[PDB]
Ligand binder design. Sequence first.
Ligand SMILES: CCCCCCCCCCCCCCCCCC(=O)OC[C@H](COP(=O)(O)OCCN)OC(=O)CCCCCCCCCCCCCCCCC
Ligand SMILES: CCCCCCCCCCCCCCCCCC(=O)OC[C@H](COP(=O)(O)OCCN)OC(=O)CCCCCCCCCCCCCCCCC
Ligand SMILES: CCCCCCCCCCCCCCCCCC(=O)OC[C@H](COP(=O)(O)OCCN)OC(=O)CCCCCCCCCCCCCCCCC
Ligand SMILES: CCCCCCCCCCCCCCCCCC(=O)OC[C@H](COP(=O)(O)OCCN)OC(=O)CCCCCCCCCCCCCCCCC
Ligand SMILES: CCCCCCCCCCCCCCCCCC(=O)OC[C@H](COP(=O)(O)OCCN)OC(=O)CCCCCCCCCCCCCCCCC
Ligand SMILES: CCCCCCCCCCCCCCCCCC(=O)OC[C@H](COP(=O)(O)OCCN)OC(=O)CCCCCCCCCCCCCCCCC
Ligand SMILES: O=P(O)(O)O[C@H]1[C@H](OP(=O)(O)O)[C@@H](OP(=O)(O)O)[C@@H](OP(=O)(O)O)[C@H](OP(=O)(O)O)[C@H]1OP(=O)(O)O
Ligand SMILES: O=P(O)(O)O[C@H]1[C@H](OP(=O)(O)O)[C@@H](OP(=O)(O)O)[C@@H](OP(=O)(O)O)[C@H](OP(=O)(O)O)[C@H]1OP(=O)(O)O
Ligand SMILES: CC(C)CCC[C@@H](C)[C@H]1CC[C@H]2[C@@H]3CC=C4C[C@@H](O)CC[C@]4(C)[C@H]3CC[C@]12C
Ligand SMILES: CC(C)CCC[C@@H](C)[C@H]1CC[C@H]2[C@@H]3CC=C4C[C@@H](O)CC[C@]4(C)[C@H]3CC[C@]12C
Ligand SMILES: CC(C)CCC[C@@H](C)[C@H]1CC[C@H]2[C@@H]3CC=C4C[C@@H](O)CC[C@]4(C)[C@H]3CC[C@]12C
Ligand SMILES: CC(C)CCC[C@@H](C)[C@H]1CC[C@H]2[C@@H]3CC=C4C[C@@H](O)CC[C@]4(C)[C@H]3CC[C@]12C
Ligand SMILES: CC(C)CCC[C@@H](C)[C@H]1CC[C@H]2[C@@H]3CC=C4C[C@@H](O)CC[C@]4(C)[C@H]3CC[C@]12C
Ligand SMILES: CC(C)CCC[C@@H](C)[C@H]1CC[C@H]2[C@@H]3CC=C4C[C@@H](O)CC[C@]4(C)[C@H]3CC[C@]12C
Ligand SMILES: CC(C)CCC[C@@H](C)[C@H]1CC[C@H]2[C@@H]3CC=C4C[C@@H](O)CC[C@]4(C)[C@H]3CC[C@]12C
Ligand SMILES: CC(C)CCC[C@@H](C)[C@H]1CC[C@H]2[C@@H]3CC=C4C[C@@H](O)CC[C@]4(C)[C@H]3CC[C@]12C
Ligand SMILES: CCCCCCCCCCCCCCCC(=O)O
Ligand SMILES: CCCCCCCCCCCCCCCC(=O)O
Lengths: 606, 609
Amino acid sequence: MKFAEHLSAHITPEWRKQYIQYEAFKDMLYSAQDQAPSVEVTDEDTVKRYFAKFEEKFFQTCEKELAKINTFYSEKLAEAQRRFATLQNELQSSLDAQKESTGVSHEERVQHRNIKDLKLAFSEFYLSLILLQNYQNLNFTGFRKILKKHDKGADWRVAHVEVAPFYTCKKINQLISETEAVVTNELEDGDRQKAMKRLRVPPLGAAQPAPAWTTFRVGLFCGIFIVLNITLVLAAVFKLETDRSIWPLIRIYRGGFLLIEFLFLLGINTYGWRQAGVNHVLIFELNPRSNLSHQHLFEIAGFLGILWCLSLLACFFAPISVIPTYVYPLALYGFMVFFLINPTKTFYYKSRFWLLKLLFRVFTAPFHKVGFADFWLADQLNSLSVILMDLEYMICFYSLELKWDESKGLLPNNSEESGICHKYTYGVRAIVQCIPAWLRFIQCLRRYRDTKRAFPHLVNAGKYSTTFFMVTFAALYSTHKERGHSDTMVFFYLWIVFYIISSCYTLIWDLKMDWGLFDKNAGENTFLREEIVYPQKAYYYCAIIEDVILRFAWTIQISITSTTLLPHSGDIIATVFAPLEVFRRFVWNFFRLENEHLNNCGEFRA
Amino acid sequence: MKFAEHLSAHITPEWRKQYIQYEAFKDMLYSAQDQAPSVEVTDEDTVKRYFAKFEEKFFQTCEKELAKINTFYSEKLAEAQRRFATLQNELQSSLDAQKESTGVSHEERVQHRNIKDLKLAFSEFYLSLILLQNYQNLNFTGFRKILKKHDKILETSRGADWRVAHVEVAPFYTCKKINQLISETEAVVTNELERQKAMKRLRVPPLGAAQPAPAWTTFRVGLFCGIFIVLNITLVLAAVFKLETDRSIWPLIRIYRGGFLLIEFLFLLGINTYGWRQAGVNHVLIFELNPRSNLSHQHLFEIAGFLGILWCLSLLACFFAPISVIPTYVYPLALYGFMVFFLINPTKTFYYKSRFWLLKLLFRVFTAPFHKVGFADFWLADQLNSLSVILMDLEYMICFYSLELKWDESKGLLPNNSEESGICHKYTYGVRAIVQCIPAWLRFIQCLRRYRDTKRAFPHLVNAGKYSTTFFMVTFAALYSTHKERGHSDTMVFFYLWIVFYIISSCYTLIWDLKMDWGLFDKNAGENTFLREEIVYPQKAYYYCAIIEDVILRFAWTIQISITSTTLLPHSGDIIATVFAPLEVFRRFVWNFFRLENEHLNNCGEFRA
Ligand SMILES: CCCCCCCCCCCCCCCCCC(=O)OC[C@H](COP(=O)(O)OCCN)OC(=O)CCCCCCCCCCCCCCCCC
Ligand SMILES: CCCCCCCCCCCCCCCCCC(=O)OC[C@H](COP(=O)(O)OCCN)OC(=O)CCCCCCCCCCCCCCCCC
Ligand SMILES: CCCCCCCCCCCCCCCCCC(=O)OC[C@H](COP(=O)(O)OCCN)OC(=O)CCCCCCCCCCCCCCCCC
Ligand SMILES: CCCCCCCCCCCCCCCCCC(=O)OC[C@H](COP(=O)(O)OCCN)OC(=O)CCCCCCCCCCCCCCCCC
Ligand SMILES: CCCCCCCCCCCCCCCCCC(=O)OC[C@H](COP(=O)(O)OCCN)OC(=O)CCCCCCCCCCCCCCCCC
Ligand SMILES: CCCCCCCCCCCCCCCCCC(=O)OC[C@H](COP(=O)(O)OCCN)OC(=O)CCCCCCCCCCCCCCCCC
Ligand SMILES: O=P(O)(O)O[C@H]1[C@H](OP(=O)(O)O)[C@@H](OP(=O)(O)O)[C@@H](OP(=O)(O)O)[C@H](OP(=O)(O)O)[C@H]1OP(=O)(O)O
Ligand SMILES: O=P(O)(O)O[C@H]1[C@H](OP(=O)(O)O)[C@@H](OP(=O)(O)O)[C@@H](OP(=O)(O)O)[C@H](OP(=O)(O)O)[C@H]1OP(=O)(O)O
Ligand SMILES: CC(C)CCC[C@@H](C)[C@H]1CC[C@H]2[C@@H]3CC=C4C[C@@H](O)CC[C@]4(C)[C@H]3CC[C@]12C
Ligand SMILES: CC(C)CCC[C@@H](C)[C@H]1CC[C@H]2[C@@H]3CC=C4C[C@@H](O)CC[C@]4(C)[C@H]3CC[C@]12C
Ligand SMILES: CC(C)CCC[C@@H](C)[C@H]1CC[C@H]2[C@@H]3CC=C4C[C@@H](O)CC[C@]4(C)[C@H]3CC[C@]12C
Ligand SMILES: CC(C)CCC[C@@H](C)[C@H]1CC[C@H]2[C@@H]3CC=C4C[C@@H](O)CC[C@]4(C)[C@H]3CC[C@]12C
Ligand SMILES: CC(C)CCC[C@@H](C)[C@H]1CC[C@H]2[C@@H]3CC=C4C[C@@H](O)CC[C@]4(C)[C@H]3CC[C@]12C
Ligand SMILES: CC(C)CCC[C@@H](C)[C@H]1CC[C@H]2[C@@H]3CC=C4C[C@@H](O)CC[C@]4(C)[C@H]3CC[C@]12C
Ligand SMILES: CC(C)CCC[C@@H](C)[C@H]1CC[C@H]2[C@@H]3CC=C4C[C@@H](O)CC[C@]4(C)[C@H]3CC[C@]12C
Ligand SMILES: CC(C)CCC[C@@H](C)[C@H]1CC[C@H]2[C@@H]3CC=C4C[C@@H](O)CC[C@]4(C)[C@H]3CC[C@]12C
Ligand SMILES: CCCCCCCCCCCCCCCC(=O)O
Ligand SMILES: CCCCCCCCCCCCCCCC(=O)O
């Protein structure tokens, strides 16, 4: 799209006559491409003459429009400071009239109407300032784009555009800060939240509502998913066979359910960030022009939910009666992976390719610098470890447990489980669960070796490394219970000895390094930090309590399982707790990204 | 909303200091509203003095706003004519540059770039002209609203004589020259710049009305559509598998066909209003709807999907028979009862304005002779002509729940046997006949009233014949059926008449559709073969396909009378009728698209005159 159509789409005609006429230069460039001769048509010396002309005429035209853009941004910055002076005098007059209502009622009612009217006045003035940054940054991007199209110029953009007064003058940016500092101290008399609520203008080309077609698709997918889920519940209640164990099916489909729930919660998270003002575009280093809003994620979440409901429903009662049952769980995940890769330039190709790059960089953790996106994804994998181990179990079941001859082999004939796949034997289960905590450990050590700062890159390393010992002790306990040694219970102690640590280690951390709460300076925000982006502190306290509970939720599992001795209690509690784990990650994302935006806690961009 | 907040929604802030600052006057009214003394507080003569001072002070304030807005529109209209002259100079200079490529390539490419750029120039010129029309009519309604609010508060009528004697003669309203300025813009663009494309770019959809519906309503439309689709599929599967194959499902089909027709009609009406809005046919003026707030296509898709969901659920509950203690014959009654309740809900929720407007329209239509027929009344009374099967199904359901259903049996909705012998589904007593002729009676009486009101024997009496043919059509059909029941010879002699009138009614109401409703086959055709001079919709293939579709569908019974008399299937007639009813609603949906266009263009109904 070459930053040509969407650029004109988000261009206001009011200043369009003096923006970088990118479309006009496109027309000139293609039209003069149409008259490119060959070696025989014009001699090589004349070819060099033609190319030298082309390049120098393009560069002098660029110089002319460069001078035009500098002239406009100089006059408009003089206008911006003149408007600063005028609006400052008007706000001083409003403050004097406030003193006429404070230090010395129809008059007071008129004065607060005037206060709100000037509030709207600096709102549209902030909009004009946003238009001026549009001028600046879109001019920069158009310069780069047209010049690199000509090149396909570099020392020209650097030696003209990067030093031109139309981008070297970052004061307009801090002028926006003035518009901030003028408001909060004078308009709101010290209220930051209402300021950022009113004056902060969402981008017209990015934060605009998504097309009604995408919202309709989201609604259609959500409705189909709801009805399919209801039909699935009824099918389980009635049409499901009660004489066969349904555990392999649950274990196979628990990963897909956890992934779809995660995508839906991530859509909610990105909506929350966008509304609260946390510019995750900069934090994630995403493309400012085109990015996935919350609806574009709800769409994929609903589509995959429909896909999972249909697959599970076909697994419940066979519709074809000639196709074996296991084909549905195989095909669902197979074409989910296909949709993930999808080499063709369709179905969110930009975001899918970006995610594929991120996954490749994360998985090969030690040999790559850790950005915020990489750390964030390798942390998200920590709470989605159930998906990885469930995929491992599905592979094991399809390899060494499933009977390919029997059509209804997915649901075992017997109601008892004795296969190797769901056991901790050989340590395979232990290893596939420690993968997410291995990537984070390696990434933390890489950050330490890249910044030579022992803190917090080494405390993070210990926090991530506790799970190694915890899982190892759990595996030893399971094996020694299988064999029945005297040391068995001893290993159990070590599990509980380390588990209560590996939760506390990830509980004093989530509340202090990630969420930044319990700050030394609190003031009005009890137990919180100085600045709270989100509206109500009740959300903050609910998040604290929820994380405190969910980091120890394993206590309930280890309490019921070791006491009640139900026919099948461990699997039930694990399957119940996995969605709670994903919910905990969803809650954590809000406050982690907010703190990263505010205090730059990760020291990523510095 | 008192035309205050939604008004503030559609107000460009750049002229906000120039319109009537309605909120300000709302504040001044509320001031002295809290400053109104009593008889004991101030004596009666002083009460009159205070009230008269209030009248005079709002009156000179209204005079000040009158003068300010008059001066602003005078300045803006002088600016508009200077802009018109200057843009005419620019556009004729573009004509000269065009002649450079025509009478006197990079130059031609640049010329068409300036052509598209100037097209944009008059795009925002049209936007500014529309803003001036806003300055006119929205401010007009602003004075209307503020003065009438003051009148109600102060129990006076001097505000009415003020608006009539100041605003109605004010230069800012009497000067309709800005509307003819838009007219000149359109004429110049059509003649010089470019009809279909000219009315496509210049015509700016209203910012407060045609703006896309909130995403929280498009989402609801999607949710309802998806639930409906899945429920529809589950219902088909339940019919294929879980439906009992020993009983006759005919009473259920007949009871539940009416709701399906109504929901399909509402969905097709949503499609129709989207088509009118996109094609540029303003249905707001023609239908006499409120320009500010009206139902867009999504607001109708929402109700259609919701009612489809409810119908599908009711049919499913009648199918699976859950709870196991509530009988099967409660679900259709509950569904139709709640539909009626939702139509007549008195609370100010769920499209209260639209529902009250529809209630008024239905009351005016059904008491046909006593009310002057507008376009809305004629249109609604015409819509029932293709929805008569719903009225027939409601009559059948009434008869079934009264005289044939067994209240003792739980599974009484589906009869024990597989044969039908009840009176309800027959033509006996003419109850199935008079119910069929109700929409025709309403239309016939409405058009006779139209004649008695305009004294123009045409086309108010030819249309009366069109709506009266079906009287003889139903009379002969019912009499033939009754005489065939007994077996008298004359029944055969009567049958001819039915078929005879079948080719005298469907023909008669065909030449009407293609000539006086749609207005095609006009004497002046030109390039538009078989069509009228000006066509709004893009492709003429749509028009020809519509002609073929209407020709086929107005003659539907030809197939039915061809099949039920040949195969002699035990239940061919009911199957064919149930198949044809949705086709009948589709034929009405197609007819609307072109009837409204012709009414907009040629004022064929002669309604607004
Ligand atoms: C046993 C049966 C159980 C069945 C459960 C199956 C799952 C049910 C799923 C429920 C619906 C999920 C999606 C609902 C929200 C859809 C959002 C959407 O697409 O609309 C956009 C919405 C409004 O648009 P606006 O904010 O004006 O524009 C923003 C510009 N980008 O803008 C927004 O995005 C903001 C508002 C929506 C986001 C906040 C609320 C999200 C949903 C909260 C949970 C709802 C219930 C979830 C499932 C039940 C479990 C609790
Ligand atoms: C495989 C291991 C199993 C464990 C789980 C691992 C995968 C979890 C799901 C993916 C991670 C969550 C989504 C990550 C993106 C979040 C970032 C965000 O808020 O913005 C969305 C992002 C923006 O991208 P954008 O700015 O449009 O790109 C412009 C490029 N110039 O755009 C995005 O949305 C980026 C992500 C791609 C698009 C949405 C996700 C598609 C996933 C398809 C299904 C995956 C199935 C995996 C197989 C499971 C089998 C068990
Ligand atoms: C991705 C994988 C590939 C796709 C897989 C196929 C699609 C999903 C699975 C559809 C399954 C449909 C049902 C198949 C029935 C097979 C036979 C059977 O066991 O019947 C179920 C039961 C039997 O009742 P019985 O009285 O024994 O019938 C006697 C027959 N004369 O009968 C009953 O209980 C009644 C039947 C109820 C069926 C409800 C099914 C609802 C969902 C269907 C699909 C909806 C999709 C909608 C969304 C699509 C996207 C727009
Ligand atoms: C045996 C199983 C059988 C299965 C059958 C089940 C029933 C099928 C039900 C299908 C329902 C589809 C209707 C839902 C469409 C709603 C679309 C919508 O609301 O989108 C908004 C759309 C674009 O909006 P925009 O122009 O951006 O802005 C408008 C300014 N306010 O604005 C619009 O509304 C305009 C564009 C959409 C409307 C025109 C096309 C809609 C209908 C297409 C056909 C649908 C299928 C019909 C059923 C099949 C039989 C033929
Ligand atoms: C009883 C006899 C049965 C035979 C059928 C008779 C009823 C058929 C359905 C109603 C007729 C179709 C609706 C006609 C609308 C035509 C105008 C149009 O396109 O605009 C929609 C109109 C605009 O209204 P608006 O401008 O918002 O309000 C004006 C004041 N501000 O707003 C509208 O949409 C107006 C209509 C009201 C809202 C939608 C319809 C709700 C009705 C609920 C279901 C009706 C159930 C009837 C009983 C059936 C039992 C068998
Ligand atoms: C407004 C009206 C009043 C309210 C209406 C109530 C809701 C609509 C009716 C729901 C009916 C649910 C099914 C009830 C079944 C009762 C038992 C029965 O006859 O079952 C039939 C079939 C075979 O059962 P069988 O195998 O014999 O059972 C053995 C017992 N262990 O067993 C089966 O049913 C097979 C499983 C398929 C069930 C498909 C049901 C799909 C629809 C459910 C509702 C969806 C609503 C979603 C939208 C809500 C809005 C968001
Ligand atoms: O839409 P995209 O896939 O992101 O590609 C477009 C555009 O592709 P097209 O040539 O097909 O229009 C190209 O614009 P130019 O720089 O060549 O003028 C270029 O991508 P390619 O050259 O590889 O095709 C560019 O860069 P990128 O793909 O890295 O984003 C990008 O345009 P935008 O950066 O403005 O989106
Ligand atoms: O929302 P609506 O039902 O259309 O009513 C509003 C508004 O009602 P509210 O007082 O509740 O805001 C009133 O505006 P005022 O004339 O009092 O300023 C008045 O209706 P009521 O007095 O009966 O409540 C008026 O008339 P109507 O309801 O007939 O339309 C109408 O305002 P609009 O005419 O601008 O729509
Ligand atoms: C993550 C996604 C791709 C799900 C993984 C599915 C694929 C990769 C896995 C799951 C089950 C697997 C099969 C399980 C068992 C056997 C039998 C063995 O003798 C040859 C390999 C073969 C045939 C495997 C091939 C790969 C396989 C199809
Ligand atoms: C560098 C340090 C801190 C981390 C190294 C992590 C690796 C080497 C650890 C983490 C989890 C461990 C496994 C946990 C459980 C089992 C099962 C047991 O019956 C044999 C050992 C075995 C298979 C362990 C092997 C080593 C292991 C894979
Ligand atoms: C008390 C414990 C057990 C449960 C409560 C935790 C849950 C329900 C709370 C804690 C954090 C909360 C979120 C915090 C902030 C926001 C942003 C706001 O714009 C919308 C609500 C939203 C998205 C909240 C939704 C509810 C939420 C997820
Ligand atoms: C209206 C929307 C929510 C869909 C309706 C779904 C719920 C309310 C329906 C669908 C399936 C129904 C159940 C189906 C079967 C039985 C068995 C018997 O004991 C009667 C009640 C009972 C237990 C029903 C109660 C209501 C029920 C649970
Ligand atoms: C158009 C909408 C309202 C649907 C019509 C439903 C209502 C009006 C109809 C449907 C069936 C009807 C019932 C059918 C049969 C009888 C038995 C008779 O001895 C008294 C009246 C009574 C009890 C009727 C009352 C009205 C009734 C409940
Ligand atoms: C004014 C004229 C032109 C139109 C009047 C239409 C009315 C009066 C007509 C139209 C349909 C007619 C009915 C059609 C069929 C039957 C059944 C028959 O067994 C007795 C007469 C009866 C019940 C008719 C009575 C009169 C009727 C109701
Ligand atoms: C083939 C014959 C027998 C029957 C088919 C008729 C149907 C499919 C045709 C006839 C009239 C047509 C409509 C006429 C005009 C419009 C308005 C336009 O903006 C979108 C398409 C739309 C909405 C058409 C859709 C298709 C349509 C409904
Ligand atoms: C005007 C143009 C389209 C001609 C229309 C012809 C139609 C209306 C005519 C011509 C032939 C006719 C059919 C000829 C023969 C019979 C057999 C008789 O036992 C019942 C009526 C029936 C089935 C007629 C029904 C009406 C009919 C189909
Ligand atoms: C499964 C049946 C679906 C019926 C309705 C489908 C509605 C969505 C069709 C999408 C077509 C592509 C249009 C994309 C336009 C956009 O995203 O702006
Ligand atoms: C049947 C369950 C539905 C669950 C999801 C419901 C989504 C819509 C809920 C609307 C809440 C109120 C907001 C209405 C806003 C509006 O009027 O546009």
